[PDB]
Each structure stands twice: as structure tokens, then as C-alpha cells.
Amino acid sequence: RNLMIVDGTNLGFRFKHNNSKKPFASSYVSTIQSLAKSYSARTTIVLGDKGKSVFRLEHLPEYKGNRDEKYAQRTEEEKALDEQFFEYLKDAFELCKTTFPTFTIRGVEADDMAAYIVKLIGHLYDHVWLISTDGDWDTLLTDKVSRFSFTTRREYHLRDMYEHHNVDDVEQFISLKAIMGDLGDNIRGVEGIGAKRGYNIIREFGNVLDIIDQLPLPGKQKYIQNLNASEELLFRNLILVDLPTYCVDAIAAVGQDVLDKFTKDILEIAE
């Protein structure tokens, strides 16, 4: 029997993209019942997001400050549609409450909880299935932990780290994010360095903490020059992207008590 951790808000947004008018709460859970059946999910855990990441906002005050700007310039109809979605989502998460253990810790991101659960109980199962279209969740991939994106109807395994992410492992994917950047979450990257360039640098010099040791790096390229002055940016981004290493801190940032209850609840389910 396997473990299934769903990315609630993420799946919800997929139901929005398919249709912004029609409610989805019913299909949502049913779809999750189908997936659990297929992946012999003996245990199923639904997780959604609730608020900005307290842990991230600390190391980067402007973290995700771009998604706010986008809502500021939305018309009445747009903000309306947006509000609808979030309503239908709240309903969707309520429906789940009747079938699957659901969780929402305001101030903690979903990936932070999924990563904490994976660590905490991942060993109690034969496999762990992450249900998300978000490839950032691929930082949890192991030979016993895999992801499944509906948008592509494809499942992603560790061996697929290069084709899908331009890197070779979980540590390189973290270093690439920290070096490259992440527009979607509004995280500044080394100006001039992208996926292909970032990889090559990593392949030749190693992970971030290894590249910091070697700065300045040889080369007369501007991105190689920009790199040599991003040390501060690198240390920062690394914390924001290194999910498996900072997930316990990310949750504890909202209370040594909230972390305790969530720990108790998980194991109280994986038993």
C-alpha cells in the first residue's frame, strides 16, 4: 500500500483552468478517490495553502510580492472570477473533510507540509505519490517518492530529473533554482544565467555551497561576472528553494505548538 499527498490548491487551479464557471467540489474528491484507488493509496492526505509563507517572507520580504501586484491590476470581473474560484476551493476542501484527512496551516506552504509528512512517515509505506502539476515538488523525488501531473497525465520519477528539469538530482534542482531564479514566486536569480547555463556551471563546479567556496569563478562572461557578485543572493535563494532541508523550520515558524499538533495528527493517521 502506498502514501498519497495531494497538492490541494494546485489541483483546484487545474479545475479552474478547465472551467472558471462550473463548481468542482464533487469531482475534486471523486478524482482523488480514483487516484487513491490506482496508486493503492492506503493512506491519503489532502493539503492546501493558506496565506503567505511566514518562513519565506522572513528571508525575502518581497517573496511572492508579484502575485499581489497581479491582483491589484485586475478588473471587477477578474477579481470576481478569482473570488469565485477561492470560494469553490474552500467548498472543495470542506467536501474532502468528509473523506480524506485534510490540512491547512495558515502561514505554511503545502510543499512544506508534504515534505514534512514524507520525511515523518514516508518510510511506513511502499511508495509515496505526490499529486501536483507543480514540478517544484520534484525536489522530493526519490526511488520511493514520485509525482503525478494531471495537465500532462504523466508521472515523474527521479530518473526523469534531466529531461524535465535540466538537472541530474534533487540537489542540483535546488542549486539551479537558487542560481537561476524563480519568476513565479518572485525570487531574483543571477542576471544572465538560465537553465542551460546554470546547469553547466553546477555540473562543473557543483552545488551552490560549493560554488560559493570557489568564487570568483574563471571566465570573462558577464553572467560569470554577475555570478561572482551574487553570493548574498545565492545564500538567500537556497533557503527559499531548499524544501527538504527547511521544511521543519518553515512549519515551526508558525509555532512550536502548531508543529507539534501537525506532527501528532500525521502519525495519528499513518497508524
Q: Which residues does the annotation mark as catalytic? A: 7, 49, 64, 67, 109, 112, 134, 136, 182, 185
Using the rule CB under 5 A, give the single segment among 110-118, 179-187, 218-226, 233-241 that binds Zn ion.
110-118
- Tell me the backbone φ, ψ of residue 2, rounded to 5 degrees: -110, 175
Closer residue to Zn ion, CB minimum distance, 89 or 110:
110
- 193 annotated to bind ligand: yes
Closer residue to Zn ion, CB minimum distance, 112 or 171:
112
CA distance 36 to 162: 28
CA distance 257 to 145: 28
Closer residue to Zn ion, CB minimum distance, 49 or 171:
49
Q: Would you mind telling me the total number of residues written for the chain in this entry? A: 271
Using the rule CB under 5 A, give the single segment among 84-92, 102-110, 211-219, 241-249 that binds Zn ion.
102-110
Question: Using a CB cutoff of 8 Å and minimum separation of 24, what contacts does 178-182 make?
Answer: 178/208, 178/234, 178/237, 178/238, 178/240, 178/241, 178/242, 179/208, 179/211, 179/227, 179/230, 179/234, 179/237, 181/237, 182/237, 182/241
- 190 annotated to bind ligand: yes
Using the rule CB under 5 A, give the single segment among 32-40, 106-114, 139-147, 216-224 that binds Zn ion.
106-114
- 126 annotated to bind ligand: no
Interface residues with Zn ion (CB under 5 A) are 110
Annotated binding site: 64, 111, 134, 136, 182, 190, 193
Annotated binding site for Mg(2+): 111, 134, 136, 182
